Design a protein around this nucleic acid. Structure first.
Length: 85
DNA sequence: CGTCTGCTCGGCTCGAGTGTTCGATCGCGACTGAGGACGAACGCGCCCCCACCCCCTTTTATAGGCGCCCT
C-alpha cells in the first residue's frame, strides 16, 4: 500500500479450469450493451445526487465528464433531462 | 458574441416476428418375385381271359423188341 509492505504466507492455491458461463456477455453495439451503458450512467448520476450536501441537491457536469470521458455530452444531457434542470 | 446546456428531430442499425419453401425421415401401400401342393390325364404296367392244339379210345391189318407171370 502507500504506507508500506506487508507479508503473508499462502498455503492453498486452486487451479481453475475452463469456465462454464452462466451469464451472456453482450455484443458490441447491442441493445443490451447500450442499455447497460445508459443505466450505468444513470446510476452514477443518482449516486452523485445522493452525495450532494446542498439542498436542493445539485451536481456539476464536469464530474460526470471526468467519470465518463468517452461519452458525448448529448447523452449526459438526456440523462439529466429527466431529473435535473 | 461566444460558450454551454438542453430539447427536438433525423438517420442508421439491429432485433424480432412472420410466412414460404424444402427436405427429413417416413410409414404405408402396391406389386412383382419366389416357392409346394393337389388334381387330372396319360401311357403304362399288370392281370386276366381267350384261343388253339393235343389227349382221352377203337379198330385193323402187320412185325421187331422189351418186360412180366405163372408152369
Amino acid at each position: 500500500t502507500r504506507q508500506g509492505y506487508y507479508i503473508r504466507e499462502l498455503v492453498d492455491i486452486f487451479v481453475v479450469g475452463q469456465q462454464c458461463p452462466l451469464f451472456e456477455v453482450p455484443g458490441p453495439n447491442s441493445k443490451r450493451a447500450n442499455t447497460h451503458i445508459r443505466d450505468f450512467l444513470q446510476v452514477f448520476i443518482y449516486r452523485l445526487f445522493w452525495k450532494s450536501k446542498d439542498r436542493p441537491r445539485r451536481i456539476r457536469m464536469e464530474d460526470i465528464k471526468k467519470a465518463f470521458p468517452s461519452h458525448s455530452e448529448s447523452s449526459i444531457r438526456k440523462r439529466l433531462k429527466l431529473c435535473a434542470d
